[PDB]
Design a binder for this molecule. Structure first.
Ligand SMILES: NC(=O)c1c(OCc2c(F)cc(Br)cc2F)nsc1NC(=O)NCCCCN1CCCC1
Ligand SMILES: CCCCCCCCO[C@@H]1O[C@H](CO)[C@@H](O)[C@H](O)[C@H]1O
Length: 334
């Protein structure tokens, strides 16, 4: 039934964890301990949520985190090994712990600013897209994909996480608060990430927000005619007007001696017009990933309720709902 729990002090707070989890050790600030799940053999990250039910917006966040994590069932996407609470009733619920695979390094810790081989980039980017295809099939946009959101083990096996200047991988529309994003915001991010692995260099290293935008326009050129027609705001329309022409650079010269398949994929991801960017499903089918591509093991998600978290409710209802998600949780198939 319910497992036995044990208590120990950690991070200015008492952690009450099941028995099966051992040698907890703080490895970040909620706050996280690294631990060994003796039950399963795995190294895990165990997250104690700081103040999950503080406000309407915290409680809302808790419930939405749990619900997304519980929905994420894919090799290339972080997923939940366990969720627990000491509480033996709702009356007494306030503490939430999440459990997932301990990961030792992210894509800065692999990248070491050294350029990777084509075959390695192929593999890493393949996995990102495999993972993205699936997130996107759930009508989930990630919105802030970047090396530090990309977890990787010693064998180059990758997982997308939700958690370096954090703006370098952002879709330009996000930085212009465009507010009706396509899924292809993530594709922009992958493009910048891919470019970086191949070259060893940040592709758009903006020092500030506008410089960032400036570096991008150097690469792709200025909004062409068909993109310019789409600017809702007049003044942008009008400012963007007041720029001069500058034509896209030839990526082949920007990416000197890269596999031309990679260049060609870079050219389909790094299109200003989000409506013209290659999708993840399409990019997986790109001849660049011929060695990895398999259309029968690149699985979609069950659909997922975006509005069901955007309710206006009272802390007690969020907390009751989160409680129900904690109770109903069934660990993944190992
Ligand atoms: N995943 C992990 O191993 C991890 C982690 O997971 C939090 C966490 C949960 F606890 C539970 C759920 Br559910 C989701 C979730 F994101 N917080 S820190 C950390 N790993 C770590 O500090 N390794 C040693 C330092 C290397 C830098 N690494 C690269 C990747 C992460 C930082
Ligand atoms: C300063 C001009 C550079 C920014 C151009 C960004 C164009 C991004 O693409 C735009 O994204 C929108 C979704 O957010 C779509 O609705 C538009 O149709 C699409 O053209």
């Amino acid at each position: 039934e319910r497992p036995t729990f044990y208590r120990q002090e950690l991070n200015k707070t008492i952690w009450e964890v099941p028995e099966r989890y051992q040698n907890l050790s703080p490895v970040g600030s909620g706050s996280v301990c690294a631990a060994f799940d003796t039950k399963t053999g795995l190294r895990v990250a165990v997250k104690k949520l700081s103040r999950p039910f503080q406000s309407i917006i915290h409680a809302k966040r808790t419930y939405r985190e749990l619900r997304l994590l519980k929905h994420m069932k894919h090799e290339n996407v972080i997923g939940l090994l366990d969720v627990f609470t000491p509480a033996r009733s709702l009356e007494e619920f306030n503490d939430v712990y999440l459990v997932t695979h301990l990961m030792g390094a992210d894509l800065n810790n692999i990248v070491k600013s050294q350029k990777l081989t084509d075959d390695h980039v192929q593999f890493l980017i393949y996995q990102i897209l495999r993972g993205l295809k699936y997130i996107h099939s759930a009508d989930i946009i990630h919105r802030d994909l970047k090396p530090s959101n990309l977890a990787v083990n010693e064998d180059s096996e990758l997982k997308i996480l939700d958690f370096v200047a954090t703006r370098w991988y952002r879709a330009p529309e996000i930085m212009l608060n465009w507010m009706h994003y396509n899924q292809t915001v993530d594709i922009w991010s992958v493009g910048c990430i891919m470019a970086e692995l191949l070259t060893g260099r940040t592709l758009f290293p903006g020092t500030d927000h506008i410089d960032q935008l400036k570096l991008i326009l150097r690469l792709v050129g200025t909004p062409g005619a068909e993109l310019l027609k789409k600017i809702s705001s007049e003044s942008a329309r009008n400012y963007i007007q007041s720029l001069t022409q500058m034509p896209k650079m030839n990526f082949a010269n920007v990416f000197i001696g890269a596999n031309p398949l990679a260049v060609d994929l870079l050219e389909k991801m790094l299109v200003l017009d989000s409506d013209k960017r290659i999708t993840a499903a399409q990019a997986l089918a790109h001849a660049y990933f011929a060695q990895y591509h398999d259309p029968d093991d690149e699985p979609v998600a069950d659909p997922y309720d975006q509005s069901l978290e955007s309710r206006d409710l009272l802390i007690d209802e969020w907390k009751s709902l989160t409680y129900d998600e904690v109770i109903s949780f069934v660990p993944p198939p190992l």
